[PDB]
Write a protein that binds this ligand. Structure first.
Ligand SMILES: N[C@@H](CCCC[N+](=O)[O-])C(=O)O
Ligand SMILES: N[C@@H](CCCC[N+](=O)[O-])C(=O)O
Ligand SMILES: N[C@@H](CCCC[N+](=O)[O-])C(=O)O
Ligand SMILES: O=C(O)CCC(=O)C(=O)O
Ligand SMILES: O=C(O)CCC(=O)C(=O)O
Ligand SMILES: [Mn+2]
Lengths: 226, 226
């Protein structure tokens, strides 16, 4: 599973040919990134299956809701996103295998398909939350494509620390897996590499046990403080 | 001068008939508020003048720049805004009078003309920076108009405190004057009062001595860290 410090970086297998083009059809994120971000969103149930396998079931499509206490800029509100068109589950399976997800109970995942654009004079913010926890138990962040960008450096932090203990610029074909409770993270802004437009296409998977799922009326009421 | 706690709330006189309608002609803020905010921006020199008066001079129009250390979500970048069309200087003068602005050197002000909209299910964020200092010496925030909104409560904080020491929802015709160094501030989101659209129109005036002005090539280089 995860390394001693609570994170691992892995290489990803080749992706299906429809995955990278699908980022061109993600609509603008109306809630984050102030026009620099484009997004689709889907949620799944993860059930340990017969054999040492995991079965994915896409859940009925719902608005994304998170807590203000984890996300001060995009928490506490209903975030209406379009569903993800492509199938990320083979890539997610790689993260499940590296995590050694506990098979004693089922899991629920949030899947964020994000493109962030940068241009000369206008960086693309990746974590306007600042140093943060996403609020889940494990998080997988996979880089699918980068074009003409600098910056975008992932930094891992122990709670309370003045500086990160690990930093690295994740490249296309890499993913980081992290203990989202024991570590916090941020990422530096995407910059234009040459003064012209550039972009960074990623998928973020947030893992929670089904018994603490981030899905349904009860979760929504808590995140929205209703 | 300001109250012993570093702030004062004042009533403003009647404003010229062109002020309130001008908020309808502010374009969207491309950089903050994720489409909920609309903005114009101008900068002035304030010079002491004969007979205990102050003279205003509108400076050549430049991009707004502020520091990431003060503004985590909109700092460190060039923010291209359009100039303010109307004349806020009589209202600003009321702030100067109540501050008892030091006449021993000239001043420079940033003037932000803001409209934030709220709607059913979509609050309008007023301080996505969180609890913050704007970075200047004094700040004046004036409410010009509020239609169909709840929330929008100003909170003043002693530096590093975990709770504000003063709270109040400023209404149309009111302004707060603040020691921007000795206190920090935030404001709760504006909410739809009844489920439909509402808006809150304000002007923010940030005061710095001319010798520390937030204007020109040197300031921009420092704020952009170049
Ligand atoms: N902080 C990201 C989401 C990261 C995943 C967290 N999750 O799914 O609760 C956002 O607000 O867009
Ligand atoms: N616009 C000037 C200051 C105000 C006028 C100076 N002046 O007399 O030409 C500046 O860029 O610093
Ligand atoms: N925090 C506000 C500006 C408040 C005035 C401060 N100033 O002029 O540097 C913004 O980023 O839009
Ligand atoms: O862009 C990234 O690498 C991760 C972003 C992230 O952690 C978030 O959006 O919560
Ligand atoms: O909307 C307000 O009352 C104030 C905004 C503020 O403090 C800032 O924008 O720095
Ligand atoms: Mn995150």
């Amino acid at each position: 599973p995860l390394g001693t410090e609570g994170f691992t970086v892995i290489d990803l297998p080749e992706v299906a040919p429809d995955i990278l083009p699908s980022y061109d059809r993600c609509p603008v994120d109306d809630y984050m990134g102030n026009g620099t971000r484009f997004k689709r969103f889907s949620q799944y149930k993860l059930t340990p299956a017969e054999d040492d396998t995991w079965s994915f079931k896409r859940l009925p499509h719902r608005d994304y809701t998170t807590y203000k206490k984890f996300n001060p800029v995009g928490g506490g509100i209903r975030r209406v996103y379009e569903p993800i068109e492509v199938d990320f589950t083979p890539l997610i399976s790689e993260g499940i295998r590296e995590l050694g997800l506990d098979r004693s109970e089922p899991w629920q995942i949030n899947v964020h398909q994000n493109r962030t654009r940068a241009d000369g004079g206008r960086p693309g913010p990746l974590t306007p939350e600042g140093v943060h926890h996403d609020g889940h138990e494990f998080v997988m962040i996979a880089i699918l494509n980068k074009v003409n960008v600098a910056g975008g450096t992932t930094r891992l932090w122990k709670p309370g620390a003045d500086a990160p203990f690990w930093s690295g610029t994740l490249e296309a074909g890499q993913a980081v897996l992290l203990d989202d409770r024991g570590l916090a993270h941020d990422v530096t802004d995407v910059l234009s590499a040459d003064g012209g437009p550039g972009h960074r296409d990623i998928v973020i998977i947030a893992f929670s046990r089904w018994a603490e799922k981030w899905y349904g009326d009860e979760h929504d009421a808590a995140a929205l403080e209703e």
